[PDB]
Amino acid sequence: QPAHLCFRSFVEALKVDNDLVEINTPIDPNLEAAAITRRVCETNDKAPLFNNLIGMKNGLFRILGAPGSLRKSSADRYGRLARHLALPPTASMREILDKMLSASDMPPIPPTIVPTGPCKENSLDDSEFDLTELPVPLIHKSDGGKYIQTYGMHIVQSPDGTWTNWSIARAMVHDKNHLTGLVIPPQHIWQIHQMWKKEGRSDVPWALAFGVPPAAIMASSMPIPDGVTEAGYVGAMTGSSLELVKCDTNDLYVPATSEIVLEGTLSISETGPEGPFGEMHGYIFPGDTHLGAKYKVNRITYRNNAIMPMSSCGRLTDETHTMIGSLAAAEIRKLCQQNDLPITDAFAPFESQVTWVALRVDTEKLRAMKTTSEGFRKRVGDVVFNHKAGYTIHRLVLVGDDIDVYEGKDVLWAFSTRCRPGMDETLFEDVRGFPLIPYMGHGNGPAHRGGKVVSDALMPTEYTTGRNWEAADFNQSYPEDLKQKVLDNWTKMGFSHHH
């Protein structure tokens, strides 16, 4: 099976790329696996495959850390993400985000039901497993539980059957047969949960599949529109119908090559302690436990020699930055364009801890609109901050065509030099806020509302007659023939891609 369609093949691809370290000696899931992974993520090293996890039994489980993190070299920096999508390892972020958006104006390709697959190789009924006995990692020393779920896909379906959602939401072990996790607005797992709660008749049929097709985990992490079944979006993106197998204990369908599948129910009534967890913004607040959603596990199925992917999330750079931020930015770009806003590109700078999105403006189109900063900022912020795709993002930075929004140095330059604090900004207090940002949930104001801003780093003439500066840089401050001469003589004089 191709790497983008099969997690086991993806692992092989990483090995073949010299982008994997296999660790065959015993590693403790209590902190050690996650510490190694954390160090990988902070240094852009090779992904760790833990083949010898202390507590592994009857095939459950090995661990792959850092599945969607960065590589060291600039040339293949996003290669691990490219390997989720059948793209060349040198793909740019623009190419990755375009691939993720491509299915948005294509017919879905619905999944294909097959009778069996590798995920059925082994099974454990409700007398034969205990979640507390598996080698579930403790990822950060102050976590409030062992977070089994950091890179699997939750599967829930609307009561009417018409929408099946795939998403990544965290969850930890509660006891032998239950998990607790976040189920919060405006996420689609929450929206579907609310539908079942209003019906009031049963718990939500649920499955959680780990080690799913890489293209599917990417779509899981993306805020594609309400009511759109991710399986058919992934089918259209990849050009192929995804092969799914029915669960044994409910009528949901999971990817045939899933490494590990949990089947059960998400309660419409019960809750349990959840958190704290070391989160995407780089913090944990020890002791901050709150009631979360509660999942009951009735059955486990799994591949021979099953591998559990894990995100050791926190400070830069891991899957929470590369996937949450970038994929939100992609959706925001599309949303802007669909609202007739002249946005060409969007990216969440890593430097902002993916709390900003920089929006590149086609300034020729802007000039035709004959508008002003105040008006334009308000329009952009209303579109984005009133939409689910804007949920995680608290600052939008508008920049003109000279800025590469995929280069954080350039975004920071433009923000710092072109946006006058206060005057060139519009604050949004009556929008949904992202409580996980420390200044929100642990800050001075409402955790769930406000704290958002549009920062206009467009210069005045960008709205009227066109850019009226040149950069004071080597590229712009010297003629072509001179630059080339300098470059050609550089090493001759005495001065100093792949790598």
By CB under 6 A, name the one of 223, 292, 309, 314 that touches ligand 4LU: 223
257 binding Mn ion? (CB under 5 A): no
By CB under 6 A, name the one of 165, 257, 258, 363 that touches ligand 4LU: 165
180 binding ligand 4LU? (CB under 6 A): no
List the structure tokens of 163: 């929408």
By CB under 8 A, name the one of 69, 220, 229, 355 that touches a second copy: 355
List the structure tokens of 172: 């930890």
Smallest separation, CB 395 to a second copy (Å):
6
Cβ distance to ligand 4LU smaller for residue 81 or 189: 189
Cβ distance to Mn ion smaller for residue 150 or 165: 165
- What is the Cα Rg of the chain in Å? 23
**Residue 299 amino acid letter:** R
By CB under 5 A, name the one of 37, 149, 150, 165 that touches Mn ion: 165
Smallest separation, CB 422 to K ion (Å):
11
Query: Can you tell me the distance from the alpha carbon of 34 to that of 12, in angstroms, rounded to the nearest whole number?
Result: 21
Size of the chain in residues: 499
The dihedral formed by the CA atoms of 54, 173, 10 and 279, expressed in degrees to the nearest 10: -110
Q: Answer yes or no: are the C-beta atoms of 312 and 65 closer than 8 Å.
A: yes
DSSP secondary structure of 114-179: -S--GGGSEEE-TTT--GGGS---B-STT-SS---BSS-EEEEE-TTSS-EEEE---EEEEETTEE
Q: Give the distance, in angstroms, between the CA of residue 248 and the centroid of all CA atoms in the same chain.
A: 29
What is the footprint of a second copy within residues 233-292 (CB under 8 A)? Answer: 278-279, 281-286
Burial class, 362, CB count within 10 angstroms (exposed 0-12 / middle 13-18 / buried 19+): middle
Answer with the entry of Mn ion, K ion, ligand 4LU, none that 324 interacts with (C-beta below 5 to 8 A by kind). Answer: ligand 4LU
What is the footprint of a second copy within residues 304-323 (CB under 8 A)? Answer: 313-316
What is the footprint of a second copy within residues 360-379 (CB under 8 A)? Answer: 373
301 binding K ion? (CB under 5 A): no
Query: Active-site residue 42, yes or no?
Result: no
What is the footprint of a second copy within residues 138-197 (CB under 8 A)? Answer: 140-142
167 binding K ion? (CB under 5 A): yes
Token pair 């899981």 in the structure block, residue? 220
373 binding ligand 4LU? (CB under 6 A): no
Residues found near ligand 4LU in the complex (CB under 6 A): 150-151, 165, 167-170, 182, 184, 187-189, 221-223, 311, 313, 319-320, 323-324
